[PDB]
Structures are given as structure tokens and as C-alpha cells.
Symmetry: C3
Subunit: 130 residues, 3 copies
């Protein structure tokens, strides 16, 4: 059984892997909140989704991408000229091999820190094992 | 088999549980459109997602949260200074016990009523049974 | 095994079926990038999700709907008065019969063409077979 769901506790900005450290579900423990990465243990087909809230009142654009190892597999942008809150979100279905790492990377801009409120999230589960 | 998908027929505002009463799928009947709550029957791991459209042309901010019993498990905001349409959306993976209730709550602001168009939605399914 | 995930390579506008032609996953091959349609082969319960990015700097509103055959099953809008990027996204759980087609239709406005960046996406998988 492999499934996880975590939220973002602190605010972040720039270009870095987002560490979702407010962990709600983590079956099998293959999501690591100290690195922000999900690591595949079983070859198969996996679903992931993310929702990253842009910081309000400071900046107009924010990008957040889902990566597999060193390769972008989904991109998203949040943008508002009045510096309002908005989301960068996307969802994927991916085949993974053991050792593959999946994570969300900020690609510019400012993300909201939601302490325990879980405004910004990352989740996933296996659909099929090879 | 446990899965459901429902849309919002009428407009709502303030602080209340959203009743998605345009029911498309409801296997096992454990989503109740008269209360807006999904009730767990089987201990296990469940996926949920929601997409709530803010009312356009009247107001600038709207909050919508997913709750488990009396506890928020995901939060979302829609915000636009020009009072444009925008979404409060999020997704979760949760462990539930029999009797647990999962639902979407408005936490301020105005939600769009989509009659039969299904602009605003709530869905879920079991991933694992304990 | 039935699952797929594809992104939008080119920009599109108006009223047309969106052809997600940047195919990442397509188990069983029942998603067709030349038509943009997923075709059911097995009666059962299916999950779908989509995220369509509105074109920035040209236009204020865009609509994107998920359809089953000739019937809308989910709707979404992106709107920004300053012509900023924003998303039309939704998710569904549907019962399908063999031959049923599921696809995303633009219902007005301009969608972003993300070449290989996968800003705009469509994915799905079977949850239950009848």
C-alpha cells in the first residue's frame, strides 16, 4: 500500500524543491518531508497532484512544477496583477521505476506558508504495480 | 465499491457546509446530498477532491475547506480584486474510520450556483480498505 | 490496466475539442491524441481530471468543459480582467459503458500552448470494472 498527503507549513520563494512538512498520510513512508521527495519502491503507475498557493500582497507571478528526477512532467503558473492569492496546481499519471524521485519545485515567485492550515498540498498513490 | 461525484446546484454564501446536490455518481450511497457529507462505512484510505467557484461580480474573496468531522484537513482560497470568477480547490488522501464524516465547508465569501452545469464539485473514492 | 496522462502542445481557441497531443502515459491506448478523446472499452467507474491554462495577455475569459459523448459532466471557467494567466480545471467520477467518449471541450476563449512544458493537461484511470 502506497499513498501520501502533506501540506506546506512555511513560506518559500525562488527556485527550490518544496518541502511539504505537514504530513497527514504517508503509507509505507516513501514520502520524505525533510527532502520533499517521494521515492518509488515498486515499478508501476502512480497518480500525483499538487496545489501551491501564491503569496498574496507581494508579487504577481509564481511557478510550480512537478518533476520526475531531473525532468519536468507538469508545469503550473499562478498570476495576478493586483497581487491577489491564486493557485499553481496540476495532476499527473506517471510510470515510475524503483529509485525514481517525484517532487514539486518552485520555478520562480513566492509561495504561501500555511502553518497547519494546509493551503498548499502534495499527494499521490500507486494505481498499478507492474 | 465506494465512489461519488456531485455538483453544486444553488448559490451559497457565508459559513456553512456546501450541499452538492447535483449527484452524478454515488456508489454505495454514502454521500448524502441533503447534508453534503460523505460518511465512512469501511476503515481505509480515501481520496477526495473539490473545486468551488467563487461568485463573479460580487465580492473579492472566498474560502472553502475540506473537513473530517470537526477538523480542517485542507484549505483553499479564491481571490480577485476585480470580482472576477476564480476557484478554491484542493485534494487530499485521508485515513478514515467508520462513522467519520468528510465534507466541504464555506469559510467566508460567496459561491457560484451552477444549476446543472457542475462548475463546483466534490468527489471521492476509496483507495485502500484496512 | 487503463490510465492516461497527456499535455497540450499547441495553442487553441474558440469552441473545439482540445487535443492533448503530448502523451506521457497511455495504458491500453484508449486515449487518442489525434481526436482528444478517451474511449471506454470496459464498463466501469472512471476518474478524470483536467487543468487548462488560459492564454495570458490576450483576453479575459476562457471556458473548458469535460464531456461524456454529447453531454457536459463538468464545467470550468478562468477569468482575469487584467488578462493574466489563470486555470479552468475540474475533476469527475463517472460510470462509462463501452464506446463512451470522454474529452475536454473549449467553450469560448483562448487556451495556452505549452509545447513540451505540460501546463495544460488531461488524465484519467479506471477505478472499478463492472
Amino acid at each position: 500500500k502506497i499513498a501520501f498527503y502533506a501540506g506546506l507549513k512555511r513560506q518559500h520563494e525562488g527556485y527550490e524543491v518544496l518541502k511539504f512538512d505537514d504530513v497527514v498520510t504517508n503509507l509505507g513512508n516513501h514520502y520524505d518531508p525533510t527532502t520533499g521527495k517521494f521515492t518509488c519502491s515498486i515499478p508501476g503507475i502512480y497518480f500525483f497532484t499538487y496545489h501551491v498557493l501564491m503569496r498574496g500582497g507581494d508579487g504577481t507571478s509564481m511557478w510550480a512544477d512537478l518533476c520526475k528526477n531531473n525532468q519536468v512532467r507538469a508545469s503550473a503558473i499562478a498570476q495576478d496583477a493586483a497581487q491577489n492569492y491564486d493557485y499553481a496546481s496540476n495532476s499527473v499519471v506517471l510510470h515510475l521505476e524503483p529509485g525514481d524521485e517525484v517532487y514539486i519545485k518552485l520555478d520562480g515567485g513566492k509561495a504561501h506558508g500555511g502553518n497547519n492550515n494546509k493551503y498548499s498540498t502534495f499527494s499521490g498513490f500507486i494505481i498499478y504495480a507492474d
